[PDB]
Design a protein around this ligand. Structure first.
Ligand SMILES: *[C@@H]1O[C@H](CO)[C@@H](O[C@@H]2O[C@H](CO)[C@@H](O)[C@H](O)[C@H]2NC(C)=O)[C@H](O)[C@H]1NC(C)=O
Ligand code: NAG
Length: 225
């Protein structure tokens, strides 16, 4: 297994950071991060918890997920696939199979003056079926106390223009003021020049995420009506 990054490096803009380039194997997560990994990415919470992310990155992921939560929290299945998209990107011990760094710049440690490397941009190979299922689970979610679709607030365009691939492209575009750096998505259910797209299992809005979480309401999910 191999990583493309590990830990945070320099400022991109505002309070947002690039991650540090790293091409070695994943590393067992410190125990002080177990609460975060359980909350955000429980699928990775087993064995040595060897990941391509550190505690800082998990904390940042939690902070960065606030706005999707703002609009999608009422449909746990919809939010769950979105979390997994970000969990795989952030932490997967097999990152190198589906991420390709495309731009870097040097990072200088202000005290030690040792040089590290900011990952400025990368390409993310995302399963076509994954992306379609993620959209499918979220497409009927209403903005809370409204009759408009939640995706019209997370897609950089009205819901009638929002589609699976342009939703993911928008969320990953730093021009949105939220994403710390741009990720360029490539959608395929098939390998591409040796890259194996991320095609994790997904949950529909008519399914329970787990034993303690119900399916989404009829209001947010036309299947259950
Ligand atoms: C993406 O899918 C993989 C494959 O199903 C998940 O990795 C498994 O996670 C389960 C649950 O903890 C473990 O029992 C397995 O041992 C894992 N399998 C392998 C081959 O790694 C992974 O959890 C999913 N990612 C996320 C973010 O949930
Ligand atoms: C998702 O796809 C299913 C068919 O697999 C369909 O019944 C449903 O209309 C779609 N939308 C939602 C919100 O689940």
């Amino acid at each position: 297994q191999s990583c493309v990054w590990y830990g945070e490096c320099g400022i991109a803009y505002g309070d947002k950071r690039y991650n540090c380039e790293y091409s070695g194997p994943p590393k067992p997560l410190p125990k002080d991060g177990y609460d975060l990994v359980q909350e955000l990415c429980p699928g990775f919470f087993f064995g040595q918890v060897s990941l391509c992310c550190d505690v800082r990155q998990l904390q940042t992921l939690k902070d960065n997920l606030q706005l999707p939560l703002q609009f999608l929290s009422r449909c746990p299945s919809c939010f769950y696939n979105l979390l997994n998209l970000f969990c795989e990107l952030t932490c997967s011990p097999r990152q190198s199979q589906f991420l390709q760094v495309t731009a870097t710049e040097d990072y200088v440690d202000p005290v030690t003056n040792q040089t590290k490397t900011n990952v400025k941009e990368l390409q993310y190979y995302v399963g076509q079926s994954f992306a379609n299922a993620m959209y499918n689970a979220c497409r009927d979610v209403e903005a809370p106390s409204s009759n408009d679709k939640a995706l019209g607030l997370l897609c950089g365009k009205d819901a009638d223009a929002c589609q699976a691939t342009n939703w993911i492209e928008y969320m990953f575009n730093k021009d949105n003021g939220q994403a710390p750096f741009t990720i360029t998505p490539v959608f395929s259910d098939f390998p591409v020049h040796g890259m194996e797209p991320m095609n994790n299992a997904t949950k529909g809005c008519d399914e329970s995420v787990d034993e303690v979480t119900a399916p989404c309401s009829c209001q947010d999910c036309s299947i259950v009506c």
